[PDB]
Design a protein around this nucleic acid. Structure first.
Lengths: 324, 60, 67, 185, 144
RNA sequence: AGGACUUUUACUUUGAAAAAAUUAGAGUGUUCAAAGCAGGCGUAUUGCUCGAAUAUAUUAGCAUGGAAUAAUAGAAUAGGAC
RNA sequence: AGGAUAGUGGCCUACCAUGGUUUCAACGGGUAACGGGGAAUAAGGGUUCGAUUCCGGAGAGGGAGCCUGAGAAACGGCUACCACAUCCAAGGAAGGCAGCAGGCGCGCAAAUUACCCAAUCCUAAUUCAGGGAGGUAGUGACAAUAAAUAACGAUACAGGGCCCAUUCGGGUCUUGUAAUUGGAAUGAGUACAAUGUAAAUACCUUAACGAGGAACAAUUGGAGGGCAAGUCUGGUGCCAGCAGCCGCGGUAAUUCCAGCUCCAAUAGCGUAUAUUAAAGUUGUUGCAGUUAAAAAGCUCGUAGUUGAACUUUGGGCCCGGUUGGCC
């Protein structure tokens, strides 16, 4: 009725009240912080009857009960204590966790988004069923077992989204990268024949590439202090260590572009073009437009035609991508 | 125009700003009691007049 | 204190015109009362279905219960 | 279905939001008349305008006309019974003139301060509100009571609160019990 | 003379002529045709609730440079396409696609607020909590 | 006034014509004010009285006056007035 | 002419004439259209709104029909269809909340299934009955009016009056900032009792408790300009974002985000949309048309709008009202 759903929990201590002030100690909530905290007001309480219920306004410690109205504020499964100093209970176990996996779309793409609220509806229909996004524009659906997911698929099917759905195995992506180093120095200039570019790519240490994805090397860290951490701990060149230029892609990717020119008085004039074009590159790679991971760049010697009018973004970006 | 803009940088500012709390500032008069505070310093105690007239300055 | 007094010629003419609430607020008569309005309106329509006293109909139901 | 409790606004904000000149004179008015809301000064000018208006309309009509006399005279003689309008000027031309200062110079607050009483102007307001002073004995906690003169000599601490008899304060009674509790037997 | 026939028996004459040149008036047209109750995404209405579909990254027209962070939505009362906008720093950190919304205008009566291309509707509430609460941390977003 | 036939309109004058509540607005210390339409005074121990005004009440319509103004008509093979 | 009707009449039916409406916009269409009273805004002139406390109007899910009755096309009456929608033991039955609450849905959006006839009035045979009309309380920031969050001493102490000055200046009028402090002043509350009420809570009353910054704490917005009020600090580095327009940031930003100080208004301010003034940016008042947006290519000519002068004008008498000296 109306689209509202009463929570289901056991009383561990205290007596429930119809409109009682209690605090929600979510799965990440901790007394010493404030995250996952929600001190709200219940509308009323209800006692179970197989498939239907009846409004009981109070219930004692140890006896299981139902707290209706707090639905749109909790976090699916959580602790509800009115005592602030209270620690966080044990966070279940289950022993299953997502393993089954499919992809969902429509036979009629004009009502496609109605299918997505059907997906959020499934989250709000089962306990251990987990619906999420794929790094390739598909709505991966995972769960307990094959039938489990299929019943959850029969749910998404008739009930929740209630429209035609296309199911396929979860379409993967395999991080384009490199085994060896650029054999020789790759050369490339503007379509408007002039200003050239020279580089070579090498295999970065996942020890440090993972250090990117763990807060050690940040695209905006201490070129001086972080130099000590990558020269003494990661055995790199503290020279180009402070010469790092960009994290491709998204501005924090496992790929980096590095300065190594000497006689180029006008290199800084094309950097913006380089960093953003380096992104379009680490975005869609040659092989099959797959993002890169642990891919480094050594910008050797780059000549730029006299004035910055021909040495501009409009034609440098196309060169860099092609040089990379 | 550009629909697929990168949003991994959004919120940068209100993220690493030096967390500086609000120092102990004594309560100020509210309402009629306020016009009292204003009027006594805005006219009764007055301020400078370098050229024509000024108000809230800076440290120099 | 702007009030409003009423001096009746007699106490007899009091329990004649004088509205209940005032004289009852004093303590002249006893707290006269009937069930709440919700009991009264509900009881009103239940008696509006039944025709006449019809205690033979309450006895008619005492028939479905033996048959 | 009852009936209209006819509402209407007494003040009127300016066709301008931050006119330097206009704001400086009105803040000095809240220090000379101890007010707090421009609405309180606006309210004055609004009633001041309604006045000035009807005055103007009546002022235009053919002199000797029953209206210019009825609505006029009767009006004038009221702003007077409140002591705002000068006795000498009885040709509704000082009314057209006037200024907020004058209408505001006849408020319970300005007279409560001028008739000594609460020393400072503001301290005068601190009392009006804390139940004190009265008319014929009709106590008031309305700092903007509009003294009308025919009530100016009756201004004094009403039979309630100290400085006019009655029972003083609860902190004083507590001070009496706090005095006999410290040293006594 | 000069134009308008200053006559005593040319009332309706000067009337028609007037109503006519009234159509050349901008805001008069929008009313005597119900442009709002037909085209305007918020057909004759002020604000409106909907459903967030995509977290767009709308560009900024000259001469300013930077991404704005708008959101294309499908309104509940129409479903018509509206490429909305979102105020304050971040927000998108606590917005999330497919959430409840309530939009309004840019005091432009259509038109773009300025540098933001075409975007004619910005956000106010989300999940029924509003930015300020989540922008000043006076509450956290529910299970919406 | 039983009676006989009369140039009309438009314009303008005062009144009238009207449901109030609302507008302006009389007056009156709701403690003040939007209000409200109440009160004010006496032998406060057997009551006296002032109120709860007027106007706009807009267009058409109605009644008197005006006769400037926009018109309008009248005697021609005399369709003549007395 | 008759019929039908309470009654006039193409209201309807015979028989007859060819007519009646129309550029003074009929007819057709839209209406985010109940009209009128009236509301919002105001210099005048207009403009926009008026579902809504009242009045006339219309309907009760969408219809059409009709009993009774003075009165209904009633639906808290009924019959049938349509759409519905509920009960069942399966044969049947009943029902419209655009009446009061209330539930879903619809939504930007809109309150309690609480009390009661005491008021106001009505209905009835009719003082006594009844009235989810209406009256009250709850919820309530649609508007509206009043106004708490303290004020006086006060001590260290400089400023601006002064009778006083070689220059060792007291102190003399006080203006405040005072991390010393000092007591009265208090409704917001709480609570005997009474008041109020149909009953009670609250308005108005009042014992007893109730103010010293940790209180009983007021905020929303803004500070380049426009528009009153910082070139001050810390991070930001045309990113994040602001930006009602113009316009800010690309490593010293008066416009970012936080500090601090401060400002416009104040229990209201900011938001959006709508409408008015602005706007003489809608024009009778009162615009523009040579180039700025705009004189039809030219003339004729309707309808419309509009159109010379000329008709007892002028002179004389007397009187009744209202202003002022004046005597």
């Amino acid at each position: 009725d109306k689209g509202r759903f009463y929570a289901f929990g056991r009383v561990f201590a205290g007596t429930v009240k119809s409109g009682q002030k209690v605090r929600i100690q979510g799965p990440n909530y901790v007394p010493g912080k404030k995250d996952d905290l929600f001190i709200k007001a219940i509308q009323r309480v209800v006692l179970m009857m197989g498939r239907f219920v009846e409004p009981i306004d109070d219930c004692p410690a140890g006896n299981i009960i139902g707290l209706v109205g707090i639905d749109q504020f909790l976090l699916k499964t959580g602790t509800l204590t009115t005592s602030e100093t209270a620690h966080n209970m044990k966070v279940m176990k289950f022993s299953v966790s997502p393993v089954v996996q499919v992809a969902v779309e429509v036979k009629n793409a004009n009502d496609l988004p109605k299918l997505v609220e059907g997906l959020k509806r499934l989250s709000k229909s089962d306990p251990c069923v987990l619906t999420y996004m794929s790094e390739s524009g598909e709505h991966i659906v995972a769960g307990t077992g094959e039938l489990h997911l299929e019943i959850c698929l029969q749910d998404l099917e008739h009930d929740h989204a209630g429209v035609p759905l296309k199911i396929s195995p979860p379409v993967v992506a395999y991080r384009e990268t490199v085994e060896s180093e650029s054999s020789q120095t790759a050369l490339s200039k503007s379509p408007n024949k002039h200003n050239r570019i020279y580089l070579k790519a090498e295999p970065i240490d996942e020890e440090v590439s993972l250090a990117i994805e763990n807060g050690i090397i940040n695209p905006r860290d201490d070129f001086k202090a972080r130099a000590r951490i990558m020269a003494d701990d990661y055995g790199w060149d503290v020279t180009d260590a402070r010469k790092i230029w960009c994290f491709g892609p998204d501005g924090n990717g496992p790929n980096l572009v590095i300065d190594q020119t000497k006689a180029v008085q006008y290199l800084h004039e094309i950097k913006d073009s380089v960093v953003a074009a380096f992104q379009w590159a680490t975005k869609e790679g040659p092989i099959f437009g797959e993002e890169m991971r642990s891919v480094r760049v050594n910008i050797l010697d780059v000549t730029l035609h006299a004035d910055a009018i021909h040495r501009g973004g409009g034609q440098i970006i196309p060169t860099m991508r092609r040089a990379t | 125009a550009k629909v697929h803009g990168s949003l991994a940088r959004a919120g940068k500012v209100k993220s690493q700003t030096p967390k500086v709390e609000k120092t102990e500032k004594p309560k100020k008069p509210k309402g009629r009691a306020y016009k009292r505070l204003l009027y006594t310093r805005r006219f009764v105690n007055v301020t400078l007049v370098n050229g024509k007239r000024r108000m809230n300055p800076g440290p120099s | 204190s702007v009030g409003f007094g009423l001096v009746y010629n007699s106490v007899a003419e009091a329990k004649k015109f004088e509205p209940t609430y005032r004289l009852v607020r004093y303590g002249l008569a006893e707290k006269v009362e009937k069930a709440s309005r919700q009991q009264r309106k509900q009881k009103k329509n239940r008696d509006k279905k039944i025709f006449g006293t019809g205690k033979r109909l309450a006895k008619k139901v005492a028939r479905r219960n033996a048959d | 279905p009852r009936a209209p409790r006819t509402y209407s606004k007494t003040y009127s904000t300016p066709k301008r939001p931050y006119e330097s000149s206009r704001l400086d004179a009105e803040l000095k008015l809240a220090g000379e008349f101890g007010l707090k809301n421009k609405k309180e000064i606006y309210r004055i000018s609004f009633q001041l305008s309604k006045i000035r208006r009807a005055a103007r309309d009546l002022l235009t009509r053919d002199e000797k006309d029953p209206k210019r006399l009825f609505e006029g005279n009767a009006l004038i003689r009221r702003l007077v019974r409140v002591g705002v309008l000068s006795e000498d000027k009885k040709k509704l031309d000082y009314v057209l003139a006037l200024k907020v200062e004058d209408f505001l110079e006849r408020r319970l607050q300005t007279q409560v301060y001028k008739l000594g009483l609460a020393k400072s102007v503001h301290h005068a307001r601190v009392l009006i509100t804390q139940r004190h002073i009265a008319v014929g004995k009709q106590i008031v906690n309305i700092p903007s009571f509009m003294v009308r003169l025919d009530s100016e000599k009756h201004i004094d601490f009403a039979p309630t609160s100290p400085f006019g008899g009655a029972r003083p304060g609860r902190v004083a009674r507590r001070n009496a019990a706090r005095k006999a509790e410290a040293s006594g037997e | 003379g000069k134009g308008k026939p200053r006559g005593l028996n040319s009332a309706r004459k000067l009337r028609v002529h007037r109503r006519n040149n009234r159509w050349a008036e901008n805001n008069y047209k929008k009313r005597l045709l119900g442009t709002a109750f037909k085209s305007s995404p918020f057909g004759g209405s002020s604000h409106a609730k909907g459903i967030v579909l995509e977290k767009l990254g709308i560009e900024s027209k000259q001469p300013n440079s930077a991404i704005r962070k708008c959101v294309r939505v499908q309104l509940i009362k129409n479903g018509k396409k509206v490429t909305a906008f979102v105020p304050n720093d971040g927000c998108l950190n606590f917005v999330d696609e497919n959430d409840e919304v309530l939009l309004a205008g840019f005091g432009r009566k259509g038109k773009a607020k300025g540098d933001i291309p075409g975007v004619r509707f910005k956000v106010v509430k989300v999940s029924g909590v509003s930015l300020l609460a989540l922008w000043k941390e006076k509450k956290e977003k529910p299970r919406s």
